[PDB]
Amino acid sequence: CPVSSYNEWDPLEEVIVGRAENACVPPFTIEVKANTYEKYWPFYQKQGGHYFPKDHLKKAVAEIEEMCNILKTEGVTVRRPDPIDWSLKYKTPDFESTGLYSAMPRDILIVVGNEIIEAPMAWRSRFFEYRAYRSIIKDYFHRGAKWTTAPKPTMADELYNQDYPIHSVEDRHKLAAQGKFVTTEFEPCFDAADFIRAGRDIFAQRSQVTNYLGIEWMRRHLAPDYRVHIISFKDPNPMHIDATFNIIGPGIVLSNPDRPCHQIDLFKKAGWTIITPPTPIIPDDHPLWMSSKWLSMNVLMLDEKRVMVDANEVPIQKMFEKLGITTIKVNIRNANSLGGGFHCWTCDVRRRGTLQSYLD
Amino acid sequence: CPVSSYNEWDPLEEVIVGRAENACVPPFTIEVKANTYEKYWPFYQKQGGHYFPKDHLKKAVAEIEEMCNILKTEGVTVRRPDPIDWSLKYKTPDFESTGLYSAMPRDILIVVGNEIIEAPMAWRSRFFEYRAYRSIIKDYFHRGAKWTTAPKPTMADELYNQDYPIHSVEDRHKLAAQGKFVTTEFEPCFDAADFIRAGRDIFAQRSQVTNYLGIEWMRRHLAPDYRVHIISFKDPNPMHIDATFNIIGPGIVLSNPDRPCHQIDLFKKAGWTIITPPTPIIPDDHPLWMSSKWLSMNVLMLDEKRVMVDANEVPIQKMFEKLGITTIKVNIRNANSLGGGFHCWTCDVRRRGTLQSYLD
Ligand SMILES: NCCC[C@H](N)C(=O)O
Ligand SMILES: NCCC[C@H](N)C(=O)O
């Protein structure tokens, strides 16, 4: 029973850590543009289809190897996806594209109990991302784990709102209020990272890459054992929930101050502790091609009292320290450029613990 | 609850009927050759990648339209997959290929209860076959049905036994005895048609296209409600179980005389009636590019006492008649060339009845 994880904090025993090797800038299509800050449009317009700066990828490779060494020191078993050239151009009857990377296991795999679920994805450059993880998954399957792949979309034009006000407009907030984004409700789609686990309750967010059909598929597939709840936040470009509402312990959650939750009272009434982390201190001159500066709260909990946190983000380190949580500081400044922090770069396969309810 | 079918005989209410339109001869790769009679090798060697003879496809289209008219007359609701050009060449990071058709819903979709399952397939030319059925499936999903897609294989060389004694050898029987075929155990794969339902018990056959990993995935995915049993027969080229062991009623099964079951005693001890149909009378000059002459026993039961059977196969018609089963004769002689009879050309979506056990 190699696979067994019901939440984000029980004592970690096995984890899959991503790879930065051969990452490629995704073609600048509608869904990618919806996620990109105006500042990087030229980079994407010129680099689409080529490898991310190799000098930079080399630094990220180094940081993640060290992170892996630390995990092993901390008693965690580490597995890595297979190396793959993401520049290969593929063609389905609906579209053609080059790949992205297998840097973020959290984006595609989610473990609910003894079951590993491969998300369908919503980006065309991530259609074949599951190929890097099949060697690991088949091993767990041979060893008794359940394996599920949610329905893979066609990703035909109908899935994308071709006339989304990407170009800048902020009334994206308005559509966002209407539960309307760059992805339509044409067919199910989602990134596993829009779901965050708390035992019998999983919280999901309708985002640029996760539609209501995708959430309904998960809800229906996991009921009656698990309840999937939908929550929303003040965010004009949501993609993944772990740099917005990161659950760090039974009844403790880190809530991004810039992205308040519309349903925060559900949690206050449950007697949950909502901690708002201090601001990130990452330099504005450092490239973050795929995300915001909020990767600082994208921590990974080794256990309730041990958190893997960025070495450079001292303010948040002190925050955990005043709470009695031992900080294990690792530097992943360059890996951050690919789009994620510790929680994004990993997928907890096995955590010592049982299925419980924390919402009462 | 549009979807609800636990077996092959309860009163039929809704069915998906395949399309012959734009069917293409599949590229002559190892797995295709393993299924092709020496007699048609030249046809495949010359026609690979092109449409099957259009004059012939036109006759099949006619026969299936009539079959659909009859089903509507018999009170059955008919749904059809979307028309698609199967000649489009696609490319995954593992291989490149042209498609086949969406003529056989039974090959790719199987209904277990309120859940529709899309098989992964094992042939490269059938990788994207699910695209023709997504419009129908999403409708059922919106209407409350469960939807599952088994893990889609990579279909890389490792899945095929490159040195299979296809060329003719018959010791295929020997490997067949060893549970060894053209598909390895590299990753899960299967055609839904290798499974045949009897309520709480589903029987599966390890075949050229269905491996043990594929069967184990199904067994594990459906337990504990359903028990998936593996059975074998004397067959040097198994692909699909419905022209070998077609279950026609609670405890009644048609067993192909040329393909005896190694576990027939399991059924005799259960008090099941094993009927061996008389030989097919289809002319040897008629082309059957994808199967044997045994399509005659590939009947579809409208209910326990009503069977849709081929108009030309009088011997088997008399057989059902002596058993008190009303024969609804339809001619599908040209549709047979594509590879299947009534059971292959349909997928029972809803049958009036409940989940029961028939093995005691
Ligand atoms: N993998 C998590 C990324 C979180 C979010 N897209 C952000 O920019 O904060
Ligand atoms: N779709 C059922 C085909 C059955 C088998 N391959 C045969 O040739 O009899």
Side-chain angles (χ1 to χ4, degrees), chain A residues 255-305:
Chain A
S255 169
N256 181 320
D258 286 3
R259 303 164 186 170
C261 183
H262 298 132
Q263 305 71 207
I264 200 67
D265 258 85
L266 148 67
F267 300 103
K268 302 212 276 195
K269 288 183 191 65
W272 279 32
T273 301
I274 294 80
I275 306 298
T276 62
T279 45
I281 65 174
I282 192 164
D284 301 70
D285 51 274
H286 187 254
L288 293 178
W289 300 299
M290 299 270 306
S291 65
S292 79
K293 283 177 167 187
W294 281 104
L295 296 181
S296 54
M297 67 169 281
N298 195 230
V299 305
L300 168 68
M301 305 288 298
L302 279 288
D303 71 40
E304 292 189 39
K305 299 297 198 175

Side-chain angles (χ1 to χ4, degrees), chain B residues 175-217:
Chain B
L175 288 164
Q178 294 159 72
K180 301 196 60 192
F181 303 78
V182 74
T183 47
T184 66
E185 295 288 337
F186 176 61
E187 52 190 339
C189 71
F190 68 88
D191 277 18
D194 273 311
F195 301 83
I196 191 124
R197 306 161 297 129
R200 282 189 179 279
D201 298 279
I202 296 165
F203 297 94
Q205 138 184 262
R206 202 293 195 204
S207 80
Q208 296 286 25
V209 294
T210 294
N211 62 17
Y212 292 109
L213 262 184
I215 298 176
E216 181 54 31
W217 186 88

Side-chain angles (χ1 to χ4, degrees), chain B residues 35 37 101 104 106-107 126 193 205 235 237-244 256 259 290-295 297-298 338-341 343-345:
Chain B
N35 181 66
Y37 283 45
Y101 53 36
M104 315 303 162
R106 190 74 58 177
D107 287 6
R126 308 187 78 177
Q205 138 184 262
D235 193 346
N237 178 49
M239 186 178 92
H240 307 344
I241 207 180
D242 48 352
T244 299
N256 181 320
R259 303 164 186 170
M290 299 270 306
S291 65
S292 79
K293 283 177 167 187
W294 281 104
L295 296 181
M297 67 169 281
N298 195 230
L338 295 192
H343 195 254
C344 284
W345 279 86

Side-chain angles (χ1 to χ4, degrees), chain A residues 94 294 321:
Chain A
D94 299 282
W294 281 104
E321 287 165 19

Side-chain angles (χ1 to χ4, degrees), chain A residues 134 145 147 152 217 220, chain B residues 91 134 145 147 152 217 220:
Chain A
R134 289 289 171 83
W147 172 19
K152 203 76 195 185
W217 186 88
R220 189 174 307 172
Chain B
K91 187 182 177 205
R134 289 289 171 83
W147 172 19
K152 203 76 195 185
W217 186 88
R220 189 174 307 172

Side-chain angles (χ1 to χ4, degrees), chain B residues 61-350:
Chain B
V61 169
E63 298 168 356
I64 304 302
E65 286 307 324
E66 183 52 23
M67 176 188 160
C68 290
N69 290 149
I70 290 160
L71 284 163
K72 287 151 183 170
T73 285
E74 290 299 306
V76 176
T77 303
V78 173
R79 302 283 310 256
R80 308 288 298 288
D82 295 339
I84 284 170
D85 183 8
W86 298 100
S87 64
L88 180 161
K89 185 161 220 181
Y90 45 88
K91 187 182 177 205
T92 76
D94 299 282
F95 66 90
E96 187 178 357
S97 183
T98 41
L100 185 57
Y101 53 36
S102 60
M104 315 303 162
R106 190 74 58 177
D107 287 6
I108 182 172
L109 305 187
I110 182 176
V111 176
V112 183
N114 302 128
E115 182 186 6
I116 172 147
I117 300 169
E118 301 185 14
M121 303 318 267
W123 282 21
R124 295 188 168 174
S125 59
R126 308 187 78 177
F127 191 94
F128 285 108
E129 191 159 316
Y130 61 88
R131 290 183 64 247
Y133 304 92
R134 289 289 171 83
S135 296
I136 296 163
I137 298 162
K138 297 183 288 175
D139 180 54
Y140 293 150
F141 184 71
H142 286 298
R143 302 200 270 143
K146 276 185 163 199
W147 172 19
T148 287
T149 55
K152 203 76 195 185
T154 53
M155 288 188 196
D157 296 348
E158 298 90 292
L159 185 58
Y160 308 103
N161 193 251
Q162 254 71 216
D163 60 28
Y164 190 66
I166 52 123
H167 49 48
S168 192
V169 75
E170 294 321 289
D171 62 31
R172 321 221 317 188
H173 268 291
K174 144 181 176 174
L175 288 164
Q178 294 159 72
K180 301 196 60 192
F181 303 78
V182 74
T183 47
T184 66
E185 295 288 337
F186 176 61
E187 52 190 339
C189 71
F190 68 88
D191 277 18
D194 273 311
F195 301 83
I196 191 124
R197 306 161 297 129
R200 282 189 179 279
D201 298 279
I202 296 165
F203 297 94
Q205 138 184 262
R206 202 293 195 204
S207 80
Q208 296 286 25
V209 294
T210 294
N211 62 17
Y212 292 109
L213 262 184
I215 298 176
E216 181 54 31
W217 186 88
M218 274 291 254
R219 195 200 65 70
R220 189 174 307 172
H221 176 255
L222 297 165
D225 287 275
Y226 298 82
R227 300 163 259 159
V228 172
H229 315 265
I230 299 175
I231 54 184
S232 48
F233 311 86
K234 183 182 187 175
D235 193 346
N237 178 49
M239 186 178 92
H240 307 344
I241 207 180
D242 48 352
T244 299
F245 198 75
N246 195 175
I247 303 177
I248 70 176
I252 314 176
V253 59
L254 259 34
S255 169
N256 181 320
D258 286 3
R259 303 164 186 170
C261 183
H262 298 132
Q263 305 71 207
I264 200 67
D265 258 85
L266 148 67
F267 300 103
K268 302 212 276 195
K269 288 183 191 65
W272 279 32
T273 301
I274 294 80
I275 306 298
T276 62
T279 45
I281 65 174
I282 192 164
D284 301 70
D285 51 274
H286 187 254
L288 293 178
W289 300 299
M290 299 270 306
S291 65
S292 79
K293 283 177 167 187
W294 281 104
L295 296 181
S296 54
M297 67 169 281
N298 195 230
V299 305
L300 168 68
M301 305 288 298
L302 279 288
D303 71 40
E304 292 189 39
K305 299 297 198 175
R306 273 186 306 163
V307 59
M308 181 163 301
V309 54
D310 199 275
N312 308 283
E313 295 292 336
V314 180
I316 194 163
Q317 293 178 12
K318 299 304 181 183
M319 188 214 84
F320 286 112
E321 287 165 19
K322 278 161 192 177
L323 274 170
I325 295 170
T326 302
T327 57
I328 300 195
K329 318 163 203 72
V330 183
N331 179 25
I332 59 169
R333 175 58 67 75
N334 290 289
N336 281 177
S337 304
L338 295 192
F342 303 100
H343 195 254
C344 284
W345 279 86
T346 59
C347 177
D348 51 311
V349 167
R350 189 172 64 256

Side-chain angles (χ1 to χ4, degrees), chain A residues 5-7 9 112-113 196-203 222-229 272 354-360:
Chain A
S5 185
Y6 302 98
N7 50 59
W9 56 85
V112 183
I196 191 124
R197 306 161 297 129
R200 282 189 179 279
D201 298 279
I202 296 165
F203 297 94
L222 297 165
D225 287 275
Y226 298 82
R227 300 163 259 159
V228 172
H229 315 265
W272 279 32
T354 47
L355 182 45
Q356 299 172 47
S357 184
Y358 305 103
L359 225 45
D360 286 76

